[PDB]
Amino acid sequence: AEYFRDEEGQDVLLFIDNIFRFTQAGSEVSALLGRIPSAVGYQPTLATDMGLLQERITTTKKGSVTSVQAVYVPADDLTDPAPATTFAHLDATTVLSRGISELGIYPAVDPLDSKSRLLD
Amino acid sequence: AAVVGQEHYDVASKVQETLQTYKSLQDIIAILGMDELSEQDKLTVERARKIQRFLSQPFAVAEVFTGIPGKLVRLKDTVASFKAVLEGKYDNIPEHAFYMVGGIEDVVAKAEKLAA
Amino acid sequence: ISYAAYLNVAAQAIRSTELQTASVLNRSQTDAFYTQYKNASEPTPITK
Amino acid sequence: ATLKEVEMRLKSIKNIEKITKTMKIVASTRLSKAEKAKISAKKMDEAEQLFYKNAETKNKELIVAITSDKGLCGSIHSQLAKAVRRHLNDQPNADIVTIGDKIKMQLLRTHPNNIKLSINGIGKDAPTFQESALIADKLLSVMKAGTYPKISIFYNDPVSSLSFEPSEKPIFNAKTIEQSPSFGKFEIDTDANVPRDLFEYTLANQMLTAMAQGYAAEISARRNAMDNASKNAGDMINRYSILYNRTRQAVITNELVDIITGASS
Amino acid sequence: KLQFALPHETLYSEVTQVNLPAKSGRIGVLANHVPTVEQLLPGVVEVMEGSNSKKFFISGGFATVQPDSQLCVTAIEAPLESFSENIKNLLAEAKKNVSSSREAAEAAIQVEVLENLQSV
Amino acid sequence: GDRQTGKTAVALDTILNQKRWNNGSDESKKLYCVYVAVGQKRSTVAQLVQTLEQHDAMKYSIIVAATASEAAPLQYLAPFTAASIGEWFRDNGKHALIVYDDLSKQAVAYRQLSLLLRRPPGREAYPGDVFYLHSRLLERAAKLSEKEGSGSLTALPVIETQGGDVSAYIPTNVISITDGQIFLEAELFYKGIRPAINVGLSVSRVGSAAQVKALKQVAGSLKLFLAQYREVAAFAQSDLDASTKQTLVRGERLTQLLKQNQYSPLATEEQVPLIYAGVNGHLDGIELSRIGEFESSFLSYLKSNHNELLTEIREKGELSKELLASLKSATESFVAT
Amino acid sequence: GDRQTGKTAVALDTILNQKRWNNGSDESKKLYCVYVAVGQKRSTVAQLVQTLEQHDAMKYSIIVAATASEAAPLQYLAPFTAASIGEWFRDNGKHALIVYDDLSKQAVAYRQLSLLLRRPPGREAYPGDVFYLHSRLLERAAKLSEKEGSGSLTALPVIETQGGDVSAYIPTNVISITDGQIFLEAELFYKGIRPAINVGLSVSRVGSAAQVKALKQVAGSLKLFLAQYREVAAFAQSDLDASTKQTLVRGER
Amino acid sequence: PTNVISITDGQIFLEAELFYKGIRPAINVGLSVSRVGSAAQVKALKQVAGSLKLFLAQYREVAAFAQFGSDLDASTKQTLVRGER
């Protein structure tokens, strides 16, 4: 993405799949590296590792990457540290719903659950 | 009861029991209203709601922060005040009257204040 | 015997070509009881 | 434990939720039949009222009250009780006939002096002429209804399908029928004792209507109440769900700490 | 119009001719009738709307011609055909009941109903 | 599903049904099943072996066995070892079905190894890379491309829920890794609905993409009916709407119909008729006690009256309007008797 | 208060209002405000800077920065360093303010550092010296005595409660160290109260004296009145007395 | 607690809520068990207290039902009245 933005002067958009699996992957690498796991068994490098990922996605002068990420909420518990840390980085949420799709509406975006930082 | 005297102990026992009832039915109260309580219990609950509120008193070192002039109430006075309340001898005046005030006499006076 | 009670017994007899319905049968059968009272004091809940 | 004690309490709340949902729905079913009946009953009553209006009216008191035996029909029981108590001030010594256990309980408590007749086996049944007739017969014989120069009945008028306003009306004594402004525009027959008959006839016909109006309000109230119950239960589901979730995270962390401490050695 | 009604059911609730059995003997109402109050006795009733005639068995009630040509008939539980043969069987039982049998009044009513059936 | 609710029976049933196609000479109709008995006591595996021999299924069966006694390294490598066996069939372009039963015992063994090797412990005292282990095994199941020779290695892992905790670390991981679940429910099992599949908690994320066309046609309704029956189930608790009563009757009969005696498989050509009756509400007339009698009778009646119909269903694999017409007639006739 | 109730904005407004005070005369009337941004995206910080430069307020404020990108030890040292800068103003006798946004993110940073130093994990996996970390930071920033020239350095540390858990270890430890709370209620935030301040969970345990006398006289007992409003609407959800209704009409309004 | 419970031959559970309820001893009658059981109590006292356990257990069950509301049959209210005493 950075090659496109920085070195080809583009605005691009980079999708990420489960960012739960980003966390999950990170947790394993920590444990293998033998670091003491933190709360709810999540990497002690939890903050910094999300920080690196979520700080190269930014608005540069040249261009901007924008990233649509998928939050596969673990145990649907949004007060879990892994979703929470993700949500801290997130700016907007687009909340596709299956109910909405069942009302024949495609886009599937649930209007009452979609909220964005820029919407002020 | 041998220490604080039988009269105190009896008064305290009744306070504990009433409040414990109120806690027990705290669930039931939330699920269904007060008018769906048993009548005998509903009296206990109404009294207890008053007792609970009665327990608050302004504090004089908090007089700055709270903004309410504190009330120091005699031990002899305290036993009397609760004793009466348990016998419902002042149950007939607002719950607000009981809240954040000193002695029983003060509750009465605040009933007059509220009445205005 | 009260006039509407008089009419009532007649109505009950009246639920007996034939053409019978549940609402009629319910209108002629009741399990209700009436509890006399005095004073507080309660003479029994004699079947209505 | 926290974890299990949370989980079992949340389950209790779930079971409560399920019951309150179920009752509310079943109540709706029951309500439709009740409502249908009340229309037909009211039509009969209106014809009787047509006479009383055109005749005019111009009437101690009797108090009759109507509620169900059944409870949890909202605040029918105590709102009606409050309006009875208000009119028990008005005439102190009046004899209260309580048709239904729930109204029996509130009034009996407030003045046990007045309870002379009370009924039972009201709420379960839908009102029928049979009940009204027998109750009427007992009001006349037992309570000597004509002796009270006022008669008043209390019931719950079902204002809206989601509301109930407790309501009362005055039954006109046999004396009233006699001395009502018009009564001669209708051809009275001295041969018949039309006041003494009509009094009795409207004692029951009015009372049955009161029971019907009340019954519809009662079933409507239970539906309303049980709906609000489901909502209250829902709030508790959410509160204990959050507690469950917090407790769950804590268990994982606390367990993890024990393992780590051991590993460290 | 004519109001002919029961509590749980409601019929015709002035109609052409109504023939009524009353404590005043029998009363006939045809179009406008001068305004009366009459107690209806247990009855065989005819209601005619036009030339069409419908025949009713009535448990007694009250009759009131209103001045505005509203014949309010109110009665408990009625049909004539519904009342009929089973009733003939009942009448035998009812005679037995009259032997034993307020119970006196009940038995009097049973005799009245037996008569009322003979009218059918 | 929940611990020892005869989970192994549900799986074993699938293996038996593969006999029907397997016997068939077309090798695009031959799934050579592999049962991977993990942590199962030798007595249990003896019963398995015996059941397989009894139903003469030991000719498309391989049973990789790591019994309870067998050492924790053997238990650890047991699904992995099994997977390699699957690869030969898959590589040969053949088809096969490998049933890893149960990965919960695979987990315990890895836990034992890691902890004993003093490798860093992790959540729920399960190895840190347990996600990685389970994913490696579960990703070997594959439907090959035609360039790499169309073959497959269908897999159906069986997971033991530790009393119903589907939030537990080993269950949650596995649920994520796989695509689809069939969730047997203990209450149903005890209440005698065997198979005890909880329809609500069963999902397939591939689902109808593979399904006999005929069987798809007559079973869209079935899913929806059961959905209604579940919702209106609790409404049995009185004053019952006519609408609710219609749902209840149709739904109760459907639920009764989907009961099936374990270790008895059925053919698609006999699945399709039974469901047709239920969908068309023919069974509504039949009383609950007589549903069972109806089922076998309907099948025999269909075979006698028109095994032509059955054979058409079998070979055509798609219900034609003419078949649905004829079938309805046959059902009406059967319902009458 | 609760995460992303635009938590930052509540504090930002405090900084903005002091423009009139700061553009005054007398060093006592001037406040010099330091905004410590710990654990915030560079983008978020860039918006803050631009916001401050939009309200032309940049000239009276410092930003000390330890963005999300910046390394975990830098984040650990980030509040302390900022507080040193603040003490220079304070010990110049001048009044000041420091808003530490968010010390909850400092906690996560110290957690990382501690764990990576393999010091035994503490309660809730937050290191055992976490109380010391916050307390040493917090009790610096003060209104000094006349001897010290009546310095001031007001402190507003911005704590991010996880799901509004006010019993949570990091929040409770902070609550006990600090005085007063300005709990930003999520329910109210959703229900359009901006600023959403639940007066029940907001206290100031040393605040009343600080207020100018006018705003003590005029506002007298309004806290009580609106903690009668909470009660009033508590039991609003039997017989509502006319008194209760009057309170409700005033309270809601 | 787990270790000790296994080792010991009875449990005499007390309960804080019942303490507040004013039952002193606050023995939680349902959780309290004696796995060495009756053959240690006075023979007389065994005879009299024969169904006392059953009654109390029934009281507990009835009480739970009673708090889910609704009018209870008279037989149940005999239990309730006895139970209270």
Swiss-Prot record, chain A:
<feature type="modified residue" description="Phosphoserine">
    <location>
        <position position="101"/>
    </location>
</feature>
<comment type="similarity">
    <text>Belongs to the ATPase alpha/beta chains family.</text>
</comment>
<comment type="function">
    <text>Mitochondrial membrane ATP synthase (F(1)F(0) ATP synthase or Complex V) produces ATP from ADP in the presence of a proton gradient across the membrane which is generated by electron transport complexes of the respiratory chain. F-type ATPases consist of two structural domains, F(1) - containing the extramembraneous catalytic core, and F(0) - containing the membrane proton channel, linked together by a central stalk and a peripheral stalk. During catalysis, ATP synthesis in the catalytic domain of F(1) is coupled via a rotary mechanism of the central stalk subunits to proton translocation.</text>
</comment>
<comment type="subunit">
    <text>F-type ATPases have 2 components, CF(1) - the catalytic core - and CF(0) - the membrane proton channel. CF(1) has five subunits: alpha(3), beta(3), gamma(1), delta(1), epsilon(1). CF(0) has three main subunits: a, b and c.</text>
</comment>
<protein>
    <recommendedName>
        <fullName>ATP synthase subunit beta, mitochondrial</fullName>
    </recommendedName>
</protein>
Curated annotation (Swiss-Prot), chain D:
<keyword id="KW-0999">Mitochondrion inner membrane</keyword>
<keyword id="KW-0139">CF(1)</keyword>
<keyword id="KW-0375">Hydrogen ion transport</keyword>
<comment type="function">
    <text>Mitochondrial membrane ATP synthase (F(1)F(0) ATP synthase or Complex V) produces ATP from ADP in the presence of a proton gradient across the membrane which is generated by electron transport complexes of the respiratory chain. F-type ATPases consist of two structural domains, F(1) - containing the extramembraneous catalytic core, and F(0) - containing the membrane proton channel, linked together by a central stalk and a peripheral stalk. During catalysis, ATP synthesis in the catalytic domain of F(1) is coupled via a rotary mechanism of the central stalk subunits to proton translocation.</text>
</comment>
<dbReference type="GO" id="GO:0005743">
    <property type="term" value="C:mitochondrial inner membrane"/>
</dbReference>
<comment type="subunit">
    <text>F-type ATPases have 2 components, CF(1) - the catalytic core - and CF(0) - the membrane proton channel. CF(1) has five subunits: alpha(3), beta(3), gamma(1), delta(1), epsilon(1). CF(0) has three main subunits: a, b and c.</text>
</comment>
<dbReference type="Pfam" id="PF00231">
    <property type="entry name" value="ATP-synt"/>
</dbReference>
<keyword id="KW-0066">ATP synthesis</keyword>
<keyword id="KW-0813">Transport</keyword>
<dbReference type="GO" id="GO:0005739">
    <property type="term" value="C:mitochondrion"/>
</dbReference>
<keyword id="KW-0472">Membrane</keyword>
<keyword id="KW-0809">Transit peptide</keyword>
Curated annotation (Swiss-Prot), chain E:
<keyword id="KW-0139">CF(1)</keyword>
<dbReference type="GO" id="GO:0015986">
    <property type="term" value="P:proton motive force-driven ATP synthesis"/>
</dbReference>
<comment type="subunit">
    <text>F-type ATPases have 2 components, CF(1) - the catalytic core - and CF(0) - the membrane proton channel. CF(1) has five subunits: alpha(3), beta(3), gamma(1), delta(1), epsilon(1). CF(0) has three main subunits: a, b and c.</text>
</comment>
<dbReference type="GO" id="GO:0005743">
    <property type="term" value="C:mitochondrial inner membrane"/>
</dbReference>
<comment type="function">
    <text>Mitochondrial membrane ATP synthase (F(1)F(0) ATP synthase or Complex V) produces ATP from ADP in the presence of a proton gradient across the membrane which is generated by electron transport complexes of the respiratory chain. F-type ATPases consist of two structural domains, F(1) - containing the extramembraneous catalytic core, and F(0) - containing the membrane proton channel, linked together by a central stalk and a peripheral stalk. During catalysis, ATP turnover in the catalytic domain of F(1) is coupled via a rotary mechanism of the central stalk subunits to proton translocation.</text>
</comment>
<protein>
    <recommendedName>
        <fullName>ATP synthase subunit delta, mitochondrial</fullName>
    </recommendedName>
</protein>
<dbReference type="GO" id="GO:0005739">
    <property type="term" value="C:mitochondrion"/>
</dbReference>
<keyword id="KW-0813">Transport</keyword>
<keyword id="KW-0809">Transit peptide</keyword>
<comment type="similarity">
    <text>Belongs to the ATPase epsilon chain family.</text>
</comment>
<keyword id="KW-0999">Mitochondrion inner membrane</keyword>
<keyword id="KW-0406">Ion transport</keyword>
Swiss-Prot record, chain F:
<protein>
    <recommendedName>
        <fullName>ATP synthase subunit alpha, mitochondrial</fullName>
    </recommendedName>
</protein>
<feature type="binding site">
    <location>
        <begin position="1"/>
        <end position="8"/>
    </location>
    <ligand>
        <name>ATP</name>
    </ligand>
</feature>
<keyword id="KW-0496">Mitochondrion</keyword>
<comment type="similarity">
    <text>Belongs to the ATPase alpha/beta chains family.</text>
</comment>
<comment type="function">
    <text>Mitochondrial membrane ATP synthase (F(1)F(0) ATP synthase or Complex V) produces ATP from ADP in the presence of a proton gradient across the membrane which is generated by electron transport complexes of the respiratory chain. F-type ATPases consist of two structural domains, F(1) - containing the extramembraneous catalytic core, and F(0) - containing the membrane proton channel, linked together by a central stalk and a peripheral stalk. During catalysis, ATP synthesis in the catalytic domain of F(1) is coupled via a rotary mechanism of the central stalk subunits to proton translocation.</text>
</comment>
<keyword id="KW-0597">Phosphoprotein</keyword>
<dbReference type="GO" id="GO:0015986">
    <property type="term" value="P:proton motive force-driven ATP synthesis"/>
</dbReference>
<keyword id="KW-0809">Transit peptide</keyword>
<dbReference type="GO" id="GO:0005829">
    <property type="term" value="C:cytosol"/>
</dbReference>
<keyword id="KW-0406">Ion transport</keyword>
<keyword id="KW-0139">CF(1)</keyword>
<dbReference type="GO" id="GO:0043531">
    <property type="term" value="F:ADP binding"/>
</dbReference>
